[PDB]
Design a protein around this ligand. Structure first.
Ligand SMILES: *[C@@H]1O[C@H](CO)[C@@H](O[C@@H]2O[C@H](CO)[C@@H](O[C@@H]3O[C@H](CO)[C@@H](O)[C@H](O[C@H]4O[C@H](CO)[C@@H](O)[C@H](O)[C@@H]4O)[C@@H]3O)[C@H](O)[C@H]2NC(C)=O)[C@H](O)[C@H]1NC(C)=O
Ligand SMILES: *[C@@H]1O[C@H](CO)[C@@H](O[C@@H]2O[C@H](CO)[C@@H](O[C@@H]3O[C@H](CO)[C@@H](O)[C@H](O[C@H]4O[C@H](CO)[C@@H](O)[C@H](O)[C@@H]4O)[C@@H]3O)[C@H](O)[C@H]2NC(C)=O)[C@H](O)[C@H]1NC(C)=O
Ligand SMILES: O=C(O)CC[C@H](NC(=O)NC[C@@H](NC(=O)CCCNC(=O)c1ccc(I)cc1)C(=O)O)C(=O)O
Ligand SMILES: O=C(O)CC[C@H](NC(=O)NC[C@@H](NC(=O)CCCNC(=O)c1ccc(I)cc1)C(=O)O)C(=O)O
Ligand SMILES: *[C@@H]1O[C@H](CO)[C@@H](O[C@@H]2O[C@H](CO)[C@@H](O)[C@H](O)[C@H]2NC(C)=O)[C@H](O)[C@H]1NC(C)=O
Ligand SMILES: *[C@@H]1O[C@H](CO)[C@@H](O[C@@H]2O[C@H](CO)[C@@H](O)[C@H](O)[C@H]2NC(C)=O)[C@H](O)[C@H]1NC(C)=O
Ligand SMILES: *[C@@H]1O[C@H](CO)[C@@H](O[C@@H]2O[C@H](CO)[C@@H](O)[C@H](O)[C@H]2NC(C)=O)[C@H](O)[C@H]1NC(C)=O
Ligand SMILES: *[C@@H]1O[C@H](CO)[C@@H](O[C@@H]2O[C@H](CO)[C@@H](O)[C@H](O)[C@H]2NC(C)=O)[C@H](O)[C@H]1NC(C)=O
Ligand SMILES: *[C@@H]1O[C@H](CO)[C@@H](O)[C@H](O)[C@H]1NC(C)=O
Ligand SMILES: *[C@@H]1O[C@H](CO)[C@@H](O)[C@H](O)[C@H]1NC(C)=O
Ligand SMILES: *[C@@H]1O[C@H](CO)[C@@H](O)[C@H](O)[C@H]1NC(C)=O
Ligand SMILES: *[C@@H]1O[C@H](CO)[C@@H](O)[C@H](O)[C@H]1NC(C)=O
Ligand SMILES: *[C@@H]1O[C@H](CO)[C@@H](O)[C@H](O)[C@H]1NC(C)=O
Ligand SMILES: *[C@@H]1O[C@H](CO)[C@@H](O)[C@H](O)[C@H]1NC(C)=O
Ligand SMILES: *[C@@H]1O[C@H](CO)[C@@H](O)[C@H](O)[C@H]1NC(C)=O
Ligand SMILES: *[C@@H]1O[C@H](CO)[C@@H](O)[C@H](O)[C@H]1NC(C)=O
Ligand SMILES: [Ca+2]
Ligand SMILES: [Ca+2]
Ligand SMILES: [Cl-]
Ligand SMILES: [Cl-]
Ligand SMILES: [Zn+2]
Ligand SMILES: [Zn+2]
Ligand SMILES: [Zn+2]
Ligand SMILES: [Zn+2]
Lengths: 694, 694
């Protein structure tokens, strides 16, 4: 039989291992020839594997690279302007790769050029709350200072935006061992920890969903009109550069001024973590100087797009997409994920060769330039937005399959909760101690839902990956799943060797997943989800799961507001309309579900599959959220303080945030009320898409 | 048989006459009790007629009314400030209605209050070109002047916007006999001409598609957050009032300053048509004073929404909509149209009672507050936007069935051209001299296409009626048809008694359509279109007709640009991408049409009906046109100089308009190129929705 079990059984751990090895021998930086070569290789193999068509879709987008003949570095400069200390020009290459060419040195992509010199202020993680503490409580002024921040907690672009708005003239990012060195494990190559010479690459844009900075709204095709650099979206205005903890220790050890305000500001290095500004008495005349010479350059990128045409509903698309570009070798990020997609295609192709086709069309994507701001996926979605919004059933992302070896991590629309629970109950746990048990059982045990006994935790979708355009811009139901660590406090920080030259095939094979069983389990989860979404006669979405979370989010936003009872009285701020809409959504969703259970009529079925498919779409507001036009979903947006995290009722949340500091409370509470009305209306409108149609 | 002929034969001239009489005995001004009563009557009768459900949908929107105890009027005021001449407080009521209560006096809806006093400047029709001529050629400065403009040529809101931007401190609108009195016909009640005491009411907003000025984007429901008046959309900033030609003659007769620049500035009254400013020597110290006391007030309005559920595709909606509110008795505008809708419902209901249902759902709408800015239709569409955009097949408007008795007038999407030609070939001409001939034959003869021998003229959709939200905001294929006059130069001016108390049942019965045969022919056209759209197995749209017009519009915009060859060289302005996209659209549309002809498979059919339905939708850009976010269609928008007229490739058109006057040509031509790229991309994207889906 050609059924999900046939699909799942064809997947092999050994194939995923071979593909990962194949994809990680040389760097595949976006815009480079080696990444174009790998695109062509994947295109060829997907054809060989049996897909109906496999094309490259190319765009010319703004990328950023260091100047090969004029290296980026930071100095401590004395009174005379002698540079007495210089940060490294490169990470020490790992064993056996000390000769591999074209390893991009650590840099912050899209930094402007400059050579600012000044006094350091240490700003902890450079979060909103850290800047509040400095400016409001400690009365330290970052204006004209170079700020030094530890990586972790939040997306680095938010750190840079926050430092910019505090008036910094430059930013130094570093990896603290507190955040990137797990106690009791060895540094690479002897373990999975970050060495003191290791450095995390990464872009520092604030795109808010725009895609290529030069062509917001429209694909960066051959005839595209581009903005000038001065009008580009999301570029930082101050130089930024990342360093490792050996170099950071040299910059931090001499810091003076104020003590750290408390222990949450102290990392693990042997330094006081003084906030500054400047150095202690003896060194008070020394300064820090950055030298940044990177250039932004419009560069061609290539997505690979594979199609497996549906037998019955070829005009309904289920999309499995993940990126191919890497900072260096991409051992975890993204080739762990791409090897799994490759094996999924291979398995589907095997069934296809035996005469099977999925009911709906499956699209497979190898995205380019994800590392430079989700550019490949977003440009292709801009090009194809009309097809995706009227035909897009679901999007499953497929970046790194693993970031740990403890248990499963799933973020998805509530519409897929039931699908995920049911599938995981049917898969074998790969975990030690759970042999013979389901993945559901091991996952539920290791990661319990905070809300419900006997269920696992599933999180809201945030951002920082290629599902952003499909979910928050276009409103297509989206999901993602990977194996993760047990390190609750490091949730948004990344695994130690994130975006470092040390992220290699050997890292994975030796220390993460020697038997490739966690990769195989993730291939079963991602592939199984795609199989059910593409083959189930009724789409496997349960609208009642949305009703449950809408009530939780309404309770949560109401609680936030109720910290300000006097203002809610003065300004007549009521959540009644939002609770009413949620109540209605609950009631209508319950009725729709009964009808879905209670209908040989393919029109009624497709009418009802259309209602299911367009239900995520109904949460889109075509006017977007305030000052963020490409975040259109009214229930979920990436947090304005941390792009990785999702926020619920983001429009109301942002209207309430720090409201006690607004100078015009009447205006500020008016805007709260406006956002309550938008959210209540959108909930009611989405509910009504599930009413009888006539 | 239950077929289109059964539908059409059930329609009766005599019924339309009875309904028109019934709808025109008392005023039905939006927001008034009598218009709520008529809403309830229509609701009851539509239920009686057999529709499955008939509801009222109410909203609370900004309307505008004169102050009953403080009348609006204009004076000539002498040196001392004695008012030596005052305009009328009301139009002389017509015979037999001199006792009818609650006739709203002439006023300009949404005028602010004020009592400005100053010197007159006469600005012809107050068009863009008229202001250019005054300021640029004649060097007359309107700043701080009261401008007096004749009605005609363009929407009155554009006149007021233009006078405002010229710095006028007030506007007087009047009906010139040149434009509102046809030679050789008698004034009402002895003929269809405007008497010198007659005055045209009408709103002077510039909403650009927004709907209720206080709630752009969102329905004006019970919990809606409203903007403050200062932030409302589209309100004029200077007082405005309309008068008749007896009063205008008194204001114009004393004008001095410059002669009219040419004969196109002279109307038919016995006055010089001096542009001013001010009065000739003897009267140079007299001034004009307006007194406006109207108030804007949030007021409840009621749409009636009738549903006839589809037998096969109940989730596909074909909408017949027209308004019910009138300025006074609404003899032509809108009850001529509403009586026809009423008879169409009655006929469909007759078939329904015999067991028939249409294949798709038909929605019938009686809109409120159209006269105050398309408020009823636009609020309901805002409420229901998700349903309409995923299920809306087509919208047929149904305002006035007649504005003349000469021949048919049709504006529609190119997707309905073939449908209109085919239907009119099947209907009887009602015209004298064409007995036994088709409507197609008489219409083609009296109104030949400028492009093609043997075809009739069909125009682009403009605006100024309730299709605006459905076509230019939401991208639903739209059409409209009425009987019209032979008066080419009066195309956008209106029939003489437009929006006057003299627009009565008697006007129509005596002078327009005594046998109600033109009404019946229009009921057959509108009803026939709805029947085919709702019942045809394959949607009756021909995508190739769009390809033909896209090429015409591309040629036209290219020609406009080519008036500036040096700039196109300097700035590298190329239309190549737009012509390429049009060529592609032509080729793909040709292939789609062959597939549509060449397929028992209901999925392929519905897939292909979805492609047809979503093809108009593909021309929508979710970012809207510059500074006009609710005009989203890239091929058609209402002209920025005249809301009644449609403009093609409006984004490029507006970028090219008056470009030789821009101070920064590089920036201005950059914006031309940007609009060419948006249009080329949108055309290509729409084409690709017609490609094979996988
Ligand atoms: C959740 O679903 C329910 C439907 O089950 C829906 O109920 C609707 O609520 C509105 C209130 O927001 C009702 O609106 C009323 O309609 C009547 C006419 O039917 C009007 O007369 C009412 O207006 C008067 O009273 C108001 C309040 O005191 C005054 O402000 C106003 O000036 C008038 O005096 C009012 O407009 C509507 O009838 C029901 N519909 C039903 C029960 O079918 C509810 O709105 C949904 N929630 C959301 C958030 O959409
Ligand atoms: C109308 O439909 C046709 C398809 O029948 C479609 O043709 C496409 O046109 C683009 C040009 O805009 C082609 O893009 C080229 O793609 C190749 C790879 O296939 C690239 O190497 C080319 O880039 C080089 O050359 C450029 C021009 O000299 C340089 O600017 C660039 O730096 C590179 O050197 C170029 O990107 C594309 O291949 C075809 N696709 C086909 C034929 O299938 C056309 O675009 C459609 N019209 C619109 C408006 O969409
Ligand atoms: O430009 C952009 O918007 C992002 C570009 C780029 N993307 C990535 O590197 N994403 C990979 C991964 N990120 C990390 O592992 C860093 C920690 C944050 N991630 C999660 O917490 C996390 C991880 C998995 C899951 I399931 C949930 C949260 C990730 O977030 O996927 C970058 O961040 O530099
Ligand atoms: O606020 C708004 O946007 C409009 C509100 C209001 N609407 C109307 O009165 N519309 C009725 C009718 N208008 C007229 O007859 C005036 C002349 C312009 N119409 C057409 O040229 C015309 C007529 C029929 C056809 I077919 C094509 C063009 C009309 O345009 O339908 C108004 O104009 O004051
Ligand atoms: C990764 O695997 C691919 C596919 O097996 C290898 O590319 C093939 O290499 C052989 C020998 O050079 C060629 O004859 C084929 O034409 C290639 N197939 C393609 C590109 O589809 C590639 O060499 C492997 N890379 C590494 C680093 O092992
Ligand atoms: C997940 O599995 C549950 C349990 O099988 C499914 O719920 C059942 O669905 C069937 C088929 O429609 C109903 O007859 C049962 O009453 C349901 N059992 C329940 C709710 O306890 C559920 O539909 C599955 N979720 C999917 C497919 O998304
Ligand atoms: C317009 O027609 C309607 C419907 O025939 C008339 O309203 C009816 O009037 C009779 C007598 O007053 C009532 O018994 C019915 O209840 C009404 N039917 C409704 C409202 O559905 C109305 O009188 C007519 N108006 C004019 C001006 O002739
Ligand atoms: C309008 O009528 C024409 C002539 O009947 C229709 O075109 C024909 O459609 C049939 C049925 O698909 C084809 O087999 C013929 O070849 C067509 N004749 C032509 C193009 O000359 C046309 O489809 C009708 N338009 C509609 C229904 O929108
Ligand atoms: C890189 O730096 C060198 C000098 O070290 C300079 O000549 C060259 O222009 C730079 N390349 C760029 C800006 O791409
Ligand atoms: C740091 O680099 C600069 C530039 O090459 C050089 O002048 C200086 O000697 C270096 N300082 C140290 C301590 O190596
Ligand atoms: C921070 O410093 C700069 C002056 O160097 C000043 O413009 C700004 O107002 C200061 N902010 C404070 C003290 O709050
Ligand atoms: C793999 O699992 C073991 C067992 O808990 C753990 O100690 C080890 O650190 C894990 N590897 C990684 C990279 O987490
Ligand atoms: C109308 O005018 C009268 C005085 O003539 C005034 O008292 C009343 O307030 C006005 N009504 C309004 C502004 O609605
Ligand atoms: C015009 O009306 C005003 C206000 O009622 C009045 O004072 C004046 O006498 C009137 N003038 C004429 C000529 O009727
Ligand atoms: C028109 O008149 C006003 C002064 O009353 C002035 O501000 C404006 O510049 C003038 N425009 C001209 C003369 O172009
Ligand atoms: C009705 O038709 C006749 C015949 O051409 C024409 O003379 C008359 O003016 C028409 N009525 C109207 C209102 O146009
Ligand atoms: Ca873009
Ligand atoms: Ca509104
Ligand atoms: Cl992922
Ligand atoms: Cl109309
Ligand atoms: Zn990644
Ligand atoms: Zn990454
Ligand atoms: Zn009208
Ligand atoms: Zn009107």
């Amino acid at each position: 039989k050609h059924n999900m079990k046939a699909f799942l059984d064809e997947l092999k751990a050994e194939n995923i291992k071979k593909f990962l090895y194949n994809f990680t021998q040389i760097p595949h930086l976006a815009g480079t020839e080696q990444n174009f070569q790998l695109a062509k290789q994947i295109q060829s193999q997907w054809k060989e594997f049996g897909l109906d068509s496999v094309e490259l879709a190319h765009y010319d987008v703004l990328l950023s690279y260091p100047n090969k003949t004029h290296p980026n570095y930071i100095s401590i400069i004395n009174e005379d302007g002698n540079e007495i200390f210089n940060t490294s020009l490169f990470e020490p290459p790992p064993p056996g790769y000390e000769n591999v060419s074209d390893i991009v040195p650590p840099f912050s992509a899209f930094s402007p050029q400059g050579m600012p010199e000044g006094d350091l202020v240490y700003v902890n993680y450079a979060r909103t709350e850290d800047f509040f503490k400095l400016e409001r409580d400690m009365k330290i002024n970052c204006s004209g200072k170079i700020v030094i921040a530890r990586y972790g907690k939040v997306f680095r672009g938010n750190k840079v935006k926050n430092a910019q708005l505090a008036g910094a003239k430059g930013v130094i990012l570093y990896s603290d061992p507190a955040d990137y060195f797990a106690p009791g494990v060895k540094s690479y190559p002897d373990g999975w920890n970050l060495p003191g010479g290791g450095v995390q690459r990464g872009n520092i844009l604030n795109l808010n969903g725009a895609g290529d900075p030069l062509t917001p709204g429209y694909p960066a095709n051959e005839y595209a009109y581009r903005r000038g650099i001065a009008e580009a979206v999301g570029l930082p205005s101050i130089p930024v550069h990342p360093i490792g903890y050996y170099d950071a220790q040299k910059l931090l050890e001499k810091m003076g001024g104020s003590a750290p305000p408390d222990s949450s500001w102290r990392g693990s290095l042997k330094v006081p973590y003084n906030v500054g500004p400047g150095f202690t008495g003896n060194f008070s005349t020394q300064k820090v100087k950055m030298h940044i010479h990177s250039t932004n350059e419009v560069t061609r990128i290539y997505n690979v797009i594979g199609t497996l045409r549906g037998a019955v509903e070829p005009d309904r698309y289920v999309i499995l997409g993940g990126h191919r570009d890497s900072w260096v070798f991409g051992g975890i990020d993204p080739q762990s994920g791409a090897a799994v997609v490759h094996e999924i295609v291979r398995s589907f192709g095997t069934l296809k060769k035996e005469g099977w086709r999925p009911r709906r069309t499956i699209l497979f994507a190898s995205w380019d330039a994800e590392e430079f701001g989700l550019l490949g996926s977003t440009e292709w979605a801009e090009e194809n937005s009309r097809l995706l919004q009227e035909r897009g059933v679901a999007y499953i992302n497929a970046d790194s399959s693993i970031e740990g070896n403890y248990t499963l991590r799933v973020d998805c629309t509530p519409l897929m909760y039931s699908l995920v629970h049911n599938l995981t109950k049917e898969l074998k746990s790969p975990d030690e101690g759970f042999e013979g048990k389901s993945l559901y059982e091991s996952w539920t045990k290791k990661s319990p839902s905070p809300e419900f006994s006997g269920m696992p935790r599933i999180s809201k979708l945030g951002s920082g990956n290629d599902f952003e355009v499909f979910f928050q811009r276009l409103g297509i139901a989206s999901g993602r799943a990977r194996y993760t660590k047990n390190w609750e406090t490091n949730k948004f920080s990344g695994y130690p060797l994130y975006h470092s030259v040390y992220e290699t095939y050997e890292l994975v094979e030796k220390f993460y997943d020697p038997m490739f069983k966690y990769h195989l389990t993730v291939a079963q989860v991602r592939g199984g989800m795609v199989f059910e979404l593409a083959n189930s006669i009724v789409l496997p979405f349960d609208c009642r799961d949305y009703a449950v979370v809408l009530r939780k989010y309404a309770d949560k936003i109401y609680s936030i507001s109720m910290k300000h009872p006097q203002e809610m009285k003065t300004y007549s701020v009521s959540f009644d309309s939002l609770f009413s809409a949620v109540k209605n959504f609950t009631e209508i969703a319950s009725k729709f579900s009964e009808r879905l259970q209670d209908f040989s009529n393919p029109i009624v079925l497709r009418m009802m599959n259309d209602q299911l498919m367009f239900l995520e779409r109904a949460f889109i507001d075509p006017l977007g959220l305030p000052d963020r036009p490409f975040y259109r979903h009214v229930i979920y947006a990436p947090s304005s303080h941390n792009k990785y995290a999702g926020e619920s009722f983001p429009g109301i949340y942002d209207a309430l945030f720090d409201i006690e500091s607004k100078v015009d409370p009447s205006k500020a509470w008016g805007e709260v009320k406006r956002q309550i009305y938008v959210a209540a209306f959108t909930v009611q409108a989405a509910a009504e898409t599930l009413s009888e149609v006539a």
